[PDB]
Amino acid sequence: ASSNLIKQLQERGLVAQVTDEEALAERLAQGPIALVCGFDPTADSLHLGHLVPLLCLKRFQQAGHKPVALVGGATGLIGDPSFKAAERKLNTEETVQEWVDKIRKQVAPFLDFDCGENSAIAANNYDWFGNMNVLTFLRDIGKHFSVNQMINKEAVKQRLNREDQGISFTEFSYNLLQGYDFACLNKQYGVVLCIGGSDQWGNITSGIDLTRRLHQNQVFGLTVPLITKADGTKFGKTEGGAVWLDPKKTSPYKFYQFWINTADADVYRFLKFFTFMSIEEINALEEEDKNSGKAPRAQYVLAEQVTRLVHGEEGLQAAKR
Amino acid sequence: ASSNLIKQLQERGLVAQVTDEEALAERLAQGPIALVCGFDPTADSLHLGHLVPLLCLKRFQQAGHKPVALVGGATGLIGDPSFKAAERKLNTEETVQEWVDKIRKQVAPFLDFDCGENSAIAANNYDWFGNMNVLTFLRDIGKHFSVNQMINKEAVKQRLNREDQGISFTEFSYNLLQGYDFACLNKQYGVVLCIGGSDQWGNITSGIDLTRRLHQNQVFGLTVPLITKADGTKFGKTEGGAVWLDPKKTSPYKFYQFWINTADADVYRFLKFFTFMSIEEINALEEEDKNSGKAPRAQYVLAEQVTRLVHGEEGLQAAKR
Numbered sequence: 001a002s003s004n005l006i007k008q009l010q011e012r013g014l015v016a017q018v019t020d021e022e023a024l025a026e027r028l029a030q031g032p033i034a035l036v037c038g039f040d041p042t043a044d045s046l047h048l049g050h051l052v053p054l055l056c057l058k059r060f061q062q063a064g065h066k067p068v069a070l071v072g073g074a075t076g077l078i079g080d081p082s083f084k085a086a087e088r089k090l091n092t093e094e095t096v097q098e099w100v101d102k103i104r105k106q107v108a109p110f111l112d113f114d115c116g117e118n119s120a121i122a123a124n125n126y127d128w129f130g131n132m133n134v135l136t137f138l139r140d141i142g143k144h145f146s147v148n149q150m151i152n153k154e155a156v157k158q159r160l161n162r163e164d165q166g167i168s169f170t171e172f173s174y175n176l177l178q179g180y181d182f183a184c185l186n187k188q189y190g191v192v193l194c195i196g197g198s199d200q201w202g203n204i205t206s207g208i209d210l211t212r213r214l215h216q217n218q219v220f221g222l223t224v225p226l227i228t229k230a231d232g233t234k235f236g237k238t239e240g241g242a243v244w245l246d247p248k249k250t251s252p253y254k255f256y257q258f259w260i261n262t263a264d265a266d267v268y269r270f271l272k273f274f275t276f277m278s279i280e281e282i283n284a285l286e287e288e289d290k291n292s293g294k295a296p297r298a299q300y301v302l303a304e305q306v307t308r309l310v311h312g313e314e315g316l317q318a319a320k321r
Numbered sequence: 322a323s324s325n326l327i328k329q330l331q332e333r334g335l336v337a338q339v340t341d342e343e344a345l346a347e348r349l350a351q352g353p354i355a356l357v358c359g360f361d362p363t364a365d366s367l368h369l370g371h372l373v374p375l376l377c378l379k380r381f382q383q384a385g386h387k388p389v390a391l392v393g394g395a396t397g398l399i400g401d402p403s404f405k406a407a408e409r410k411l412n413t414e415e416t417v418q419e420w421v422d423k424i425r426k427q428v429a430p431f432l433d434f435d436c437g438e439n440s441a442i443a444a445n446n447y448d449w450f451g452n453m454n455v456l457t458f459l460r461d462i463g464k465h466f467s468v469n470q471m472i473n474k475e476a477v478k479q480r481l482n483r484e485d486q487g488i489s490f491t492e493f494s495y496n497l498l499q500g501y502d503f504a505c506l507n508k509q510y511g512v513v514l515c516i517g518g519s520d521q522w523g524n525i526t527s528g529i530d531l532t533r534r535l536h537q538n539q540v541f542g543l544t545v546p547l548i549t550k551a552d553g554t555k556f557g558k559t560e561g562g563a564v565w566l567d568p569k570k571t572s573p574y575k576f577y578q579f580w581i582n583t584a585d586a587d588v589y590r591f592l593k594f595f596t597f598m599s600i601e602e603i604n605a606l607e608e609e610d611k612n613s614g615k616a617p618r619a620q621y622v623l624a625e626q627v628t629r630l631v632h633g634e635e636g637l638q639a640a641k642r
């Protein structure tokens with residue numbers, strides 16, 4: 001009884017929030033849809049913080065849907081303030097342009113760009129913002145945004161009720177750029193769903209509302225949960241900084257080691273978030289570790305699964321030498 | 322004892338607010354400065370609501386300063402929300418472009434464009450916003466604006482504490498456009514003072530702050546009072562709408578009639594706001610009307626003075642036929 005995709009992702013604990021779940025589930029049953037997940041070039045590589053949303057894009061593709069991997073060539077020149085305590089550093093056009101190509105190439109191996117009509121599409125919002133006049137933006141896009149609504153958006157609320165956290169007009173405008181990305185992708189590729197990290201709810205719903213206002217099309221949003229560790233410490237954060245997906249920044253060996261170090265309380269949940277093993281197999285593995293008087297083998301399984309996903313068979317082998 | 326320009330305008334009741342009056346008065350004594358007053362093309366003509374600021378630009382020129390008359394080819398495509406209850410209507414590029422030339426030509430006769438180094442300059446902010454990329458605006462200008470500060474700006478405060486008054490991102494951004502106009506004019510023409518209507522304080526101070534942030538130059542602002550009538554009704558507002566400065570919209574005859582109709586309680590104050598008669602002469606005229614047992618002749622004087630200023634000798638003559 002293949003209940004449905006949203007339900008199956010829910011079992012994995014991968015659905016934080018979703019707009020009109022009933023309507024989305026029916027839409028998904030109608031046929032393959034185009035969906036999008038965006039990634040901003042805040043560095044020359046993505047890191048573990050972007051992995052769950054990325055693999056989730058792959059889960060949709062495996063269910064027959066078409067993933068659009070958007071790299072923020074323009075949004076990365078603005079900076080997303082969503083649930084951020086401080087103003088992000090402004091990078092130069094030259095540097096972000098370079099980071100954009102690096103990230104695009106890093107994302108490609110994760111998706112299938114050669115499987116028929118549901119083949120993946122790489123997008124860059126610099127295509128439409130890169131040369132958009134400011135008056136056009138303020139009028140054609142800005143007229144549809146209520147500042148009253150924008151200021152009580154949870155993602156930036158804390159930055160407004162400050163005494164230690166302010167927000168520039170630059171980052172405050174980010175919500176309109178991402179909102180228009182949704183409308184623009186709906187118009188050109190028929191994208192009707194946008195998924196993203198948990199801090200992306202307000203940016204996504206702005207896109208839903210603007211697509212309705214501009215094109216009169218109903219689209220949807222779904223956010224994945226922010227990954228947490230039972231010990232309350234920050235996931236993907238180590239003494240040496242982030243765990244990068246780039247083998248030249250974080251070696252496959254070090255990556256494999258990061259996963260081996262997973263706590264017992266997190267490992268089964270992590271198997272669900274980061275791998276494609278069935279729920280049935282993960283539960284059986286949990287039971288197996290419970291009844292064996294052996295070291296749990298879940299950490300080894302997780303490390304093996306994610307390392308291969310991220311660095312392929314070659315990376316997995318480099319992890320043992 | 323030519324005390325000083327700010328003082329003399331104060332005697333006329335023409336100074337609503339001024340930034341660092343002491344510092345401005347000393348700067349004015351140093352020599353002729355370039356100053357600016359802007360006008361947005363919200364119609365194909367200016368009206369009585371723009372007259373006081375316009376003549377004030379002329380008062381500065383007569384004191385030896387250089388007036389820059391800025392017409393908002395770009396700002397008129399956005400709309401100033403300052404102390405406005407509702408969102409302004411968005412006009413098309415074609416229409417505003419046309420209104421811009423009409424207004425520029427209407428303003429010219431009021432200023433001297435042929436008197437040496439203090440000759441007037443006509444400016445249009447469409448020159449710098451017309452083709453400015455949105456990313457450039459948001460980054461190079463937007464980074465210097467605190468949204469926390471923008472939202473408690475008096476000019477838009479009421480639009481935020483609503484239940485009957487909201488504000489679009491479009492009009493909320495207007496403050497940055499006008500603020501940059503000041504910085505841009507300071508950089509190219511050395512403009513160090515901006516004057517404007519009373520509702521312009523926050524737009525002007527944003528320009529002062531941004532000029533400091535961008536060019537590290539100290540500039541000043543001065544607003545003229547919003548004209549009021551003793552009977553509490555709206556000045557420049559009639560049954561037929563606005564009193565236009567365009568003779569084809571409001572005939573010189575009708576214009577002269579508007580002034581003749583001035584109430585006794587307003588006429589002496591209006592002589593100060595709208596004419597170049599000395600304060601001494603206006604006071605003597607008030608005394609004369611007080612002691613004559615004749616109809617006051619102040620209304621006739623006012624009508625004659627302003628009609629000539631706005632429509633010249635030809636207009637004045639057309640007012641008697």
Ligand SMILES: N[C@@H](Cc1ccc(O)cc1)C(=O)O
Nearest residue numbers: 038039040072075080178181
């Ligand atoms: N704002 C998203 C990335 C993103 C960028 C542009 C988009 O259109 C969508 C998503 C993030 O910070 O993860």
Ligand SMILES: N[C@@H](Cc1ccc(O)cc1)C(=O)O
Nearest residue numbers: 359360361393396401499502
């Ligand atoms: N905002 C002013 C007009 C103006 C426009 C642009 C400026 O740079 C300055 C002033 C008004 O509404 O009267």
